[PDB]
From a paper:
hL3HYPDH was first discovered by Visser and colleagues who identified, through sequence alignments between orthologs of the proline racemases family, the human protein [name] (named after its gene locus and later named hL3HYPDH) which lacked racemase activity but exhibited instead proline dehydratase activity, converting trans-3-hydroxy-l-proline (T3LHyp) into Δ1-pyrroline-2-carboxylate (Pyr2C). hL3HYPDH is involved in the metabolism of hydroxyproline (Hyp), a non-standard amino acid present in the cell wall components of plants and in mammalian collagen and deriving from the post-translational modification of proteins by prolyl hydroxylase enzymes.
The final hL3HYPDH model was reliably built between amino acids 10–354 (for chain A) and 4–354 (for chain B) except for residues 150–152 and 227–239 of both chains due to the missing or poor-quality electron density. Unlike the structures of tlT3LHypD and of tcProR that both showed a closed conformation for the ligand-complexed monomer and an open conformation of the ligand-free monomer, both hL3HYPDH monomers exhibited an open conformation, consistent with the absence of ligands in both catalytic sites. However, structural alignment between the predicted and experimental hL3HYPDH models revealed a significant difference in the conformation of the mobile domains, being the experimental and the predicted structure in the open and closed conformation, respectively. In hL3HYPDH, residues Met103 and Ser275 play a stabilizing role of the open conformation through hydrogen bonding of the hydroxy group of Ser275 and the sulphur of Met103 (3.0 Å), locking Met103 in an extended conformation and protruding it toward the free substrate-binding site.
Residue numbers in the entry:
A (entry chain B): 4 to 150, 153 to 227, 240 to 354
B (entry chain A): 10 to 149, 153 to 226, 240 to 354
The structure:
């Protein structure tokens, strides 16, 4: 006898925040559809500043608990100054306001098409072009559709190797050799076996402690975080399993889009892989798979870089309406000390 | 709505929280939970509709610290509603502080007829797997909820224990609907007011494993068990090192028993308990003495505030490898 959809008791005068919940290989994304105050700014950068300095309570509500959690990520859609852009994105996380879109492009691309920010391509063509204005800059996502559903693919920034076979003394383990590469962020790459862990069986806590130790070691003796690998950097049809541990011991549920990019750069540099050769990357956390493909050579200062095609699937998970009660001490959310 | 698979019904939820711990009440889209009794229904859900639990409570649409409730008819004629609890570890029996949310819910959503205009609190009869709990909900429909504990008692006091990490420490074991070890945070060399959650968790975990060597989990305390108007801060670390967002309703119950036993508190004397995690406050009050075999128990009035956080529709894509959710382990 609750046929009629109703909201629960809330404070009228704080509008309802409405989201579409998506995920890209296990990492969630709340896209805000409605109930965010006007984000005033002549530019996306201006708008990012305004949100951080005026509407941060909105970020804290959607991303913090009790309505979110430690590994929740968010997106507020805004007009772009660029006439090329189908949409502008302000990214939200639990630590602040990110610049690197990364794999969220896969979800936002799919979203833009499915929600009509991008007109449907001619029935003859199947991949639609979505121009997303990140704080990063304009990223073009190519979304497969019918007349919709399928993989999304985007082209990386110039990705390169900063250092190879670098020996460091990681607390808890001996001197260890790491590669540091840029895939949109700086990651240390180590084999899990070289730290005395089986990536396929070991508890997440063990892989996190190990990877954290490497990240702290590299910080002093030379960086967004560390990726541990199964050590299958040798070309094969078999997927290669990696785990990304970044920031405050935070595990990525997806093969990091950045991580895929930097590993392809590393594989290219060691002569294990050629242009338009495609590997598959599997998440140790979730089992989801992204593909990388170096498409053309490039440069980044004096450094020989590569351009990488990352592709993967985003999925819809549902839709939420967030409300706040006048009384609630935890109206604007909380995070654990 | 987003593009979804038609033919898998939409799961619809009302998200609430009691002192920071969340509760998803399922409004619609759960298959018929077949069973002659609540017990039968809990069994059926665990053995046939577990995919529904995993969807609502797992990482894509939930998280490690998410809890859920499916409402069902009760066999008991007294009962306004029957509750099946869902969590990330399985199917709970402990009614718990979820009665605070469910009581408020039952009134606000008309499972309970509207109270008499004269009277400012309503009676909600909740059938938990444990049994029939009565919640008293303040109204004019918003306000705090209060319920009466089961028989709560002290199992052991000032017990020195073999802790791998700190050598030897004195702990109290009490029952508040579950068995909790109580130690002072300071006694493990931690300031409860400043220390990182990781530090307090690993300490409390160590005590829990140690006590097994001699139990739902361990509560670290402010040490302010001495009566005062000032609230007392506690942190509850139970099961697999999972922290409680609230002053545990069970925890409040057990320490009221412990405070009564040590002669720091009398009947109808009320303490306030503050969560180290979030800062939320539950009130405990021993109301009458009672018995549990030869053990002298107490009945405790636990009271707190539940708040609405919003509403979701969960969907499935037939393509999605993580349709049914996932956990890191």
């Amino acid at each position: 006898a609750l046929a009629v959809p109703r909201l629960p008791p809330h404070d009228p005068g704080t509008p309802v925040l409405s989201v579409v919940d998506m995920h890209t290989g296990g990492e969630p994304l709340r896209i805000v559809l409605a109930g965010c105050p006007e984000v005033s700014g002549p530019t996306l950068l201006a708008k990012r500043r305004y949100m951080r300095q005026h509407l941060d309570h909105v970020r804290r509500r959607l991303m913090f608990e009790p309505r979110g959690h430690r590994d929740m990520y968010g997106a507020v859609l805004v007009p772009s100054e660029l006439p090329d852009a189908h949409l502008g994105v302000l990214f939200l996380h639990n630590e602040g306001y990110s610049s690197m879109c990364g794999h969220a492009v896969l979800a936002l691309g799919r979203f833009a098409l499915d929600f009509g920010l991008v007109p449907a391509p001619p029935a003859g063509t199947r991949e639609a072009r979505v121009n997303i204005h990140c704080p990063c800059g304009l990223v073009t996502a190519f979304v497969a559709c019918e007349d919709s559903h399928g993989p999304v693919r985007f082209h990386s920034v110039p990705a390169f190797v900063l250092a190879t076979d670098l020996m460091v003394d990681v607390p808890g383990h001996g001197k260890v050799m790491v590669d540091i590469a840029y895939g949109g962020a700086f990651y240390a790459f180590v084999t899990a076996e070289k730290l005395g862990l089986d990536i396929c069986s070991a508890k997440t806590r063990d892989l996190v402690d190990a990877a954290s130790a490497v990240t702290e070691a590299v910080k002093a003796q030379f960086l967004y975080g560390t990726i541990l690998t199964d050590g299958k950097d040798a070309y094969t049809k078999e997927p290669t399993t990696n785990i990304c541990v970044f920031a405050d011991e935070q595990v990525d549920r997806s093969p990091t889009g950045s991580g895929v990019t930097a590993r392809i750069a590393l594989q290219y540099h060691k002569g294990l892989l050629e242009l338009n050769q495609m590997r598959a990357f599997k998440s140790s956390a979730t089992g989801s798979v992204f593909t990388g493909k170096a498409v053309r050579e490039a440069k980044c200062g004096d450094f020989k870089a590569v351009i990488v095609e990352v592709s993967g699937q985003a999925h819809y998970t549902g839709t939420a309406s967030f409300i706040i009660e006048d009384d609630d001490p935890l109206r604007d959310g909380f995070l654990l000390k």
